[PDB]
Amino acid sequence: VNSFSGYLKLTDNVYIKNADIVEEAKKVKPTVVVNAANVYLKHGGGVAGALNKATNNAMQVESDDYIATNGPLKVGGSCVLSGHNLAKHCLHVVGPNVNKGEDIQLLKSAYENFNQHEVLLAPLLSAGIFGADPIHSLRVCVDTVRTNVYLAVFDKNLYDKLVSSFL
Ligand SMILES: O=C(O)C[C@H](NC(=O)c1cc(F)cc2[nH]cnc12)c1ccc(Br)cc1
């Protein structure tokens, strides 16, 4: 039993809700919140900008120190950093950004990072400003992640769609 409330169950291990991931993280304090990161950990907009803003820019400060020490992530890669006031940990995962021409097949590699964590609160990788089809992203998520994933979808319209077209 865990503290996630109000999710529709899609599979044995994938759950989905219409929620603002920032507000959901602040209320659940999950062990792991996933950020839709880029390789530079520059959290300017989308989910990343919103999560970072909710940390009063502490996520960005920590991220800049990480990059200065380690260099950029790989597309499809991840790193674990602090969750600040939102979660114990933040798993920064780099999905491919279609608006940069990155190979969508890297989306499966990106979701594989979730399997290193028993339970996660997560956005749909490569959705939103990353330009991928959120329905394809949901399919890859379901077919790749084996751990328990609670997907928050900010847009109510999108959500209702994802549910009605799910197989
Ligand atoms: O709806 C989703 O969950 C996926 C994606 N979300 C974002 O891009 C997004 C951006 C942001 F700045 C803050 C956020 N907090 C939660 N998600 C976001 C999206 C896709 C299509 C459309 Br139309 C609208 C949104």
Swiss-Prot record:
Swiss-Prot/TrEMBL catalytic activity: Thiol-dependent hydrolysis of ester, thioester, amide, peptide and isopeptide bonds formed by the C-terminal Gly of ubiquitin (a 76-residue protein attached to proteins as an intracellular targeting signal)
Regulation: Inhibited in vitro by GRL-0617.
Protein name: Papain-like protease nsp3
Lineage start: Viruses, Riboviria, Orthornavirae, Pisuviricota, Pisoniviricetes
Domain Macro intervals: 1-167
Source superkingdom: Viruses
Assembly behavior: May form homohexamers. Interacts with N protein.
Localization, UniProt: Host endoplasmic reticulum membrane
Record membrane topology: Multi-pass membrane protein
Function: Responsible for the cleavages located at the N-terminus of the replicase polyprotein. Participates together with nsp4 in the assembly of virally-induced cytoplasmic double-membrane vesicles necessary for viral replication. Antagonizes innate immune induction of type I interferon by blocking the phosphorylation, dimerization and subsequent nuclear translocation of host IRF3. Also prevents host NF-kappa-B signaling. In addition, PL-PRO possesses a deubiquitinating/deISGylating activity and processes both 'Lys-48'- and 'Lys-63'-linked polyubiquitin chains from cellular substrates.
